[PDB]
Curated annotation (Swiss-Prot):
This is Peptidyl-prolyl cis-trans isomerase NIMA-interacting 1. The WW domain is required for the interaction with STIL and KIF20B. Expressed in immune cells in the lung (at protein level). Coiled coil: none annotated. It comes from Homo sapiens. Residues 1-33 form the WW domain. Interacts with STIL. Interacts with KIF20B. Interacts with NEK6. Interacts (via WW domain) with PRKX. Interacts with BTK. Interacts (via PpiC domain) with DAPK1. Interacts with the phosphorylated form of RAF1. Interacts (via WW domain) with ATCAY; upon NGF stimulation. Interacts with PML (isoform PML-4). Interacts with BCL6. Interacts with FBXW7, disrupting FBXW7 dimerization and promoting FBXW7 autoubiquitination and degradation. Directly interacts with RBBP8/CtIP; this interaction depends upon RBBP8 phosphorylation. The lineage of its organism: Eukaryota, Metazoa, Chordata, Craniata, Vertebrata. Changing residue 29 to A: Loss of binding to phosphorylated target proteins, including to phosphorylated RBBP8/CtIP; decrease in DNA repair of double-strand breaks by homologous recombination less efficient than that observed with wild-type protein.
Length: 33
């Protein structure tokens, strides 16, 4: 699936899903490869 660190999160501002990297703090809409 996602490289290390990447996970999906629901925005706390109306629930849109983004990809977040807990290692690097990166975030993006598109799926990381
Ligand atoms: Cl992880
Ligand atoms: Cl979440
Ligand atoms: Cl959030
Ligand atoms: Cl949202």
């Amino acid at each position: 699936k996602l490289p290390p660190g990447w996970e999906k999160r629901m925005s706390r501002x109306s629930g849109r899903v983004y990809y977040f990297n807990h290692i690097t703090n990166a975030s993006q809409w598109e799926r990381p490869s």
